[PDB]
Structure formats: structure tokens, C-alpha cells
Design an enzyme around this catalytic site. Structure first.
Site, PDB file in Angstrom:
ATOM      1  N   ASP A 174       0.812  -1.207   0.000  1.00  0.00           N
ATOM      2  CA  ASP A 174       0.000   0.000   0.000  1.00  0.00           C
ATOM      3  C   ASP A 174       0.852   1.266   0.000  1.00  0.00           C
ATOM      4  O   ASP A 174       1.884   1.315   0.664  1.00  0.00           O
ATOM      5  CB  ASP A 174      -0.914   0.002   1.228  1.00  0.00           C
ATOM      6  CG  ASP A 174      -1.768   1.261   1.321  1.00  0.00           C
ATOM      7  OD1 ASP A 174      -2.737   1.382   0.551  1.00  0.00           O
ATOM      8  OD2 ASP A 174      -1.456   2.141   2.156  1.00  0.00           O
ATOM      9  N   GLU A 200       1.045  -0.555  -5.147  1.00  0.00           N
ATOM     10  CA  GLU A 200       0.094   0.484  -5.499  1.00  0.00           C
ATOM     11  C   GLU A 200       0.846   1.774  -5.781  1.00  0.00           C
ATOM     12  O   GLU A 200       1.402   2.387  -4.875  1.00  0.00           O
ATOM     13  CB  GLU A 200      -0.912   0.767  -4.380  1.00  0.00           C
ATOM     14  CG  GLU A 200      -1.877   1.893  -4.760  1.00  0.00           C
ATOM     15  CD  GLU A 200      -2.480   2.605  -3.567  1.00  0.00           C
ATOM     16  OE1 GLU A 200      -1.806   2.718  -2.535  1.00  0.00           O
ATOM     17  OE2 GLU A 200      -3.633   3.066  -3.652  1.00  0.00           O
TER      18      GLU A 200
END
Ligand SMILES: [Ca+2]
Length: 448
Positions: A174, A200
């Protein structure tokens, strides 16, 4: 062959375990991306999951035992588990976590104030001209971990390694853009073996930090795919998609994780209104069919809950598997991964994995397209207002096929549950597709 994974957004561990056995495994989904399983702040909002307190496996999804049980059961069903891993930050402010731990003033049970970068705020303009601020300052107040620190790297690596020992096969990093690629490289040197890692990184162009910087540490989310697909389906011509992918400036196919929408962009974070979501019904069906049939990237099917316009709201107060009743398709869990066209597209991708070329592309210069995957399958989408009745050429064996978007082949292979598609002796198909509908056939869903 496994080719697609799904994001069971906010699904608790028991619901995931059951979903693996009853549906995901039988239907061929490769893996499941679960919401952050570690200790996070209290509160009902979905985003509380993104403010870690510790690495103890006690979250809104359940406890450590339930988590381990989910991995085991999914694994037995042939489905991998990918864990959403927070590598950039810890919770903002002060409070209590889902496992009882207290935190405050950058003081957590596993980190001290000295394990974080000195506080500063990331401003919107920093994205375009200050990589230092993007990677060292705070993303919306979240304490920015000093990812260059050996202690921090060991702590995150220990967590990742603990999850692998339990059976977790992959990880979503993330907010990877907010961490220097070199810090991730150092982190990975401490990770045992070679798990699947996807990062990401939101990069639509004009950023100081680029997506290409993370290609050597794993797969990377290609956000241009979601945006351009949505834009083309709503405002352009499908005919333009004949060279979708690297041809449009996207990253290498083998390095990309693609999607129609994700949990963030379906809420306006990282994507405008052109992003297609479950709210668009049949438009969403068609966009997924194209993504799943087209040979670019590693697709991630989204599985949402109706948030009734509230972009902060957490999930339904009812489980998916509720006393023998399935809480899908209505105003609670949407279960897009179970939608006929979507599960059918997954089936198509799984059965054409032996031929990654787009063959015999055909279009009407506008919103009707058709293409094959060699002799493994063929598909067509009609997004005009009149029936698509063109004769298209395929490389498929003549015979009768089940349109897998509307049904499936029976066990004995003598019938389909949906409409049948005929491939003539010369390999052609005389299409008959109504407005806003599609068809897809593959060599493993052939009759008698
Ligand atoms: Ca950072």
C-alpha cells in the site's frame, strides 16, 4: 489455468473462507486480496484499516485464529491469499487499536517517535515537483515511517515473513509511491523466498515519482488502464481499443495489475467520474468482459458493497453467508465476482491462457468489436443501439459452443444453460447480439 484474482473488500475471514470453498475455487479465481488483517484504529469507516497500530492479526475481519483458518481453507480450495500490507505509515494522532493497544504522538507498541520521518505535510503540488516531500512527508497526517531504517525494515519484513509461514502467498504494498524504490529493494532483501508482490503506485503521468521505478520490485498497479477503459467505454469508441496496452503508453503487460475499478477510485480517490463501477450495471458487465478477454495485465475483479453515496462508510452490518442466505446482489454486498458476465469472463481468460495474442480483430469503426485468442476462444461486444449481426472470422473448430457469459456447459457436455453459439464449417460466426450485450466462447465449453 489461474489468471485472475479478486478483492473481497471488507469481507470478514469467515465469509472469505466460505467463499473460497463454495465459489472462488470451483470457478477458477487464482487468489483473493483481503483487507488489512493487522491491528488498526477503532471506528466504522472503511479507511480505519489503513491506519495501523501494530502487526498483531486482530482486526475488523477477525482474530488470528480465524485468519489462519481462512488461509488454510482457501489454500485447500486452490485459492491464494494476498495481504494488503501497509509499508509507508502508521495511524495518525492518538487512540486505541482493535487489539487493545494504545498509541499516541508517534508512539506505538512497535515504534518510537524516532522510527518516523520528521513531520511535514504532503501538498498536492508536491506530487509534480518534489519527490522528497512525496516520500518523506505525511500522507493526510499518517505518521511516515522511516523506511530506510534497519529496525523498521526488519519489523515489516518479520511481519511479511510471519504471514508467509502461515501460508500467505502474496502481498499488496500500500502507498508504494510514498516510499523510495530503493527502500523497498532493501526491504525485499529481508523477505524469505519470492512471494507475489504488487505495488500500489498511482501514475497517470506528470508525477515526480513514476510507476516505472517500481518495476524491479514486483508488479505495479496500472491506473491508466482503469481510467482509459472507463473513458473509452463512456465517451469514446470501442474500436480504439484494438491496440490497448503498451500501445497507449501503459507499462509492460507482464508487470501490470489492471482493474475496471478499485476500492479507492470507486469513491473518487484516484479516479474521476468516468471510472465505471457496479452502479453502472450492464456498462460494468461489458467493461469487465473486455478486460477479462483482452490479454493485457493480471486482472483484479472488484467485489464491493453498496455504500449508498457515503464514501466514508464501512461495510454492511450483515455477513455475506447469513444463516444459509446469501446477502449478495442487493443493497448490502454487491458480489460482482459472482455476476454472470464477470464470472464468465474469468472462465474465458482461464481457458485461453495458452494463446495471448489478439487475433482477427473486427469492429464497425465505432462501438461493436470482436476478436479471438487464436483457436482457444472468440468474443464480441455490442455497445451500439442496434443488433450486431455481422459475420466474423474465427480460428475455432466448427461446432456448438456455450456463450459462457450467459451460462455454462453441463457435466456431461450435452447442453448449455444459456444460449448456444455456432461456429460454421469455415470458422465464421453469424453474430446475433442485442444492444449492450456480448458473447464469449472457448474451446473448453464446446458441445457433445
Ligand atoms: Ca514515506
Amino acid at each position: 489455468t489461474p489468471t485472475t484474482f479478486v478483492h473481497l473488500f471488507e469481507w470478514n475471514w469467515q465469509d472469505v473462507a466460505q467463499e473460497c470453498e463454495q465459489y472462488l475455487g470451483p470457478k477458477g479465481y487464482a487468489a483473493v486480496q483481503v483487507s488489512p488483517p493487522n491491528e488498526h484504529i477503532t471506528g466504522s469507516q472503511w479507511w480505519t484499516r489503513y491506519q495501523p497500530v501494530s502487526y498483531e492479526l486482530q482486526s475488523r475481519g477477525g482474530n488470528r485464529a480465524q485468519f489462519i483458518d481462512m488461509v488454510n481453507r482457501c489454500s485447500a480450495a486452490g485459492v491464494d491469499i494476498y495481504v494488503d500490507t501497509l509499508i509507508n505509515h502508521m495511524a495518525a494522532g492518538s487512540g486505541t487499536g482493535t487489539a487493545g493497544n494504545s498509541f499516541g504522538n508517534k508512539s506505538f507498541p512497535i515504534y518510537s517517535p524516532q522510527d518516523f520521518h520528521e513531520s511535514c505535510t504532503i501538498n498536492n503540488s508536491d506530487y509534480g515537483n518534489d519527490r522528497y516531500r512525496v516520500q518523506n512527508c505525511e500522507l493526510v497526517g499518517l505518521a511516515d515511517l522511516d523506511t530506510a531504517s534497519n529496525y523498521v525494515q526488519n519489523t515489516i519484513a518479520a511481519y511479511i515473513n510471519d504471514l508467509q509461514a502461515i501460508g500467505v502467498k502474496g502481498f499488496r504494498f500500500d502507498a508504494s509511491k510514498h516510499v523510495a524504490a530503493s527502500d523497498i529493494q532493501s526491504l525485499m532483501a529481508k523477505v524469505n523466498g519470492s512471494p507475489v508482490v504488487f505495488q500500489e503506485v498511482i501514475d497517470q503521468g506528470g508525477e515526480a515519482v513514476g510507476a516505472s521505478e517500481y518495476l524491479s520490485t514486483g508488479l505495479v498497479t496500472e491506473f491508466k488502464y482503469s481510467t482509459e477503459l472507463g473513458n473509452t467505454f463512456r465517451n469514446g469508441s470501442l474500436a480504439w481499443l484494438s491496440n490497448f496496452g503498451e500501445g497507449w503508453g501503459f507499462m509492460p503487460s507482464s508487470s501490470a495489475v489492471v482493474f475496471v475499478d478499485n476500492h479507492d477510485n470507486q469513491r473518487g480517490h484516484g479516479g474521476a467520474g468516468n471510472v465505471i463501477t457496479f452502479e453502472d450495471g450492464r456498462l460494468y458487465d461489458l467493461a469487465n468482459v473486455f478486460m477479462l478477454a483482452y490479454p493485457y495485465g493480471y486482472p483484479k475483479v472488484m467485489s464491493s458493497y453498496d455504500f449508498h453515496g457515503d464514501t466514508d462508510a464501512g461495510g454492511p452490518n450483515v455477513p455475506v453467508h447469513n444463516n444459509g442466505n446469501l446477502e449478495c446482489f442487493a443493497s448490502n454486498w454487491k458480489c460482482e465476482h459472482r455476476w454472470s458476465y464477470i464470472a464468465g469472463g474469468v472462465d474465458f481468460r482461464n481457458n485461453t491462457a495458452d494463446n495471448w495474442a489478439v487475433t482477427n480483430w473486427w469492429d464497425n469503426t465505432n462501438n461493436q468489436i470482436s476478436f479471438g485468442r487464436g483457436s482457444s476462444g472468440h468474443m464480441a461486444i455490442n455497445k451500439e443501439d442496434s443488433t450486431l449481426t455481422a459475420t466474423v472470422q474465427t480460428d475455432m473448430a466448427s461446432g456448438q459452443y456455450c456463450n459462457v457469459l450467459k451460462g455454462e456447459l453441463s457435466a456431461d457436455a450435452k447442453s448449455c444453460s444459456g444460449e448456444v453459439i455456432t461456429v460454421n464449417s469455415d470458422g465464421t460466426i453469424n453474430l446475433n447480439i442485442g444492444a449492450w450485450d456480448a458473447m464469449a466462447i472457448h474451446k473448453n465449453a464446446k458441445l457433445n
